[PDB]
Design a protein around this ligand. Structure first.
Ligand code: FAD
Ligand code: 0JI
Length: 337
């Protein structure tokens, strides 16, 4: 299991936080997962599952057995003409899996290109970008129940997907996702509702655009605008876009005409969290080794040497400010440990 004791978790989380783990193992299959669980239980330790550590905020030393999911495997399950069921192990890296799918001529994942992390973590966070969510293509997953060790399958309804949310993120220590099945397509019409994606695609003058073509535009836009943790530690968008009811939206828009929002089918309004934080004065904020990115106001950053506690406290500060100022509470996207 390539076990290490008292090992630093710095290279395993995109914020670059330097806490240390009491044990660190690497699981390459389901037997390893079972061995790691028994080992944690035999030794009186909790078990902390990690993938690419790109949605984790570590705030203290980890008195647990940290299990890095590193199982490999990607395959086509059934090809049903336009629809195609594909399957990947939890440890498979997400963006190489998107590229694997497009190289097979399958559409569906192109708008989720270049998101960090693993296939296993993607349903838990219901990852989303440029108008697409994982739940749009989700068929099923296999998860180990950590209350009794049994395996069960979840279809889409049983996953209780929501905005950057799922049953698994609500009960975080309960299920351990082993493999994920998605339904991809061929020859479908192509999701270009986002202005800048459509504009840059059109500028390229492809006679007949495809999913691969969309994927290369999204990669270029993401590389252009989103800080890379390689250089500046972060977990992407720290906050979710909040939803408010129609009355709250009336008082806010009647007080701020410039309010950026996305109307929903049920009459509620999803506010742009980045606009709230910018309009609150936080963009470019910096206090000691932590701050808010100068152009992407949603992105909290580790300039170097931050503890996880300092990141946590800046976020709580931004939260309190935006609550006090516009009466809106910003929820975080990252998971806190
Ligand atoms: C630069 C950057 C850009 C990003 N852009 C986006 C974006 O556009 N859209 C978006 O939605 N997200 C985005 N994210 C965050 C996104 O959630 C992660 O990139 C990714 O989904 C997390 O996967 P991971 O494997 O890194 O999970 P980790 O951070 O390792 O884990 C996160 C949580 O999920 C759990 N988890 C991981 N694997 C398993 C498993 N097999 N079983 C059970 N629990 C598990 C962990 O226990 C932890 O609670 C971004 C992050 C970064 C750093
Ligand atoms: C573009 C984007 C989306 C989206 O397009 O919905 N979600 N997060 N995110 C993001 C934002 C800042 C940093 C990293 C990722």
């Amino acid at each position: 299991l390539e076990l290490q004791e008292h090992c630093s978790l710095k290279p395993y989380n995109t914020f670059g936080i330097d806490v240390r783990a009491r044990l660190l193992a690497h699981a390459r299959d389901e037997a390893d997962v079972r061995e790691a669980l028994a080992l944690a239980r035999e030794r009186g330790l909790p078990l902390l599952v990690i993938g690419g550590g790109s949605n984790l905020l570590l705030t203290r030393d980890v008195e647990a057995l940290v299990l890095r999911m590193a199982s490999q495997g990607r395959r086509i399950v059934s090809d049903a003409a336009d629809s195609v069921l594909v399957e990947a192990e939890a440890g498979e890296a997400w963006d190489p899996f998107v590229q694997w799918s497009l190289e097979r001529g399958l559409a569906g994942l192109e708008n989720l290109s270049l998101i960090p992390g693993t296939v296993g973590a993607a349903p838990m966070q219901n990852i989303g970008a440029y108008g697409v969510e994982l739940k749009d293509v989700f068929d099923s997953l296999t998860a180990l129940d950590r209350q009794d060790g049994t395996l069960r399958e979840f279809d889409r309804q049983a996953c209780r997907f929501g905005y950057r949310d799922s049953l698994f993120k609500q009960e975080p220590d309960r299920w351990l996702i082993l493999r994920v099945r998605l339904r991809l397509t061929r020859r479908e019409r192509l999701h270009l509702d986002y202005g800048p994606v459509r504009q840059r695609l059109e500028e390229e003058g492809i006679a007949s655009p495809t999913a691969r073509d969309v994927s290369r535009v999204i990669c270029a836009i993401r590389r252009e605008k989103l800080p890379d943790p390689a250089v500046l530690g972060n977990a992407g968008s720290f906050f979710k876009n909040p939803l408010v009811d129609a009355t709250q939206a009336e008082r806010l828009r009647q007080a701020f005409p410039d309010l950026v929002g996305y109307p929903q089918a049920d009459g509620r309004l999803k506010l742009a969290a980045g606009w709230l934080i910018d309009k609150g004065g936080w963009k470019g904020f910096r206090d000691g080794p932590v701050g808010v990115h100068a152009q992407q106001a949603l992105v909290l950053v580790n300039h170097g040497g931050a503890t996880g506690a300092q990141v946590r406290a800046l976020a709580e500060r931004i939260q309190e400010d935006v609550r006090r100022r516009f009466g809106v509470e910003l929820e975080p996207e990252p998971n806190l440990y």
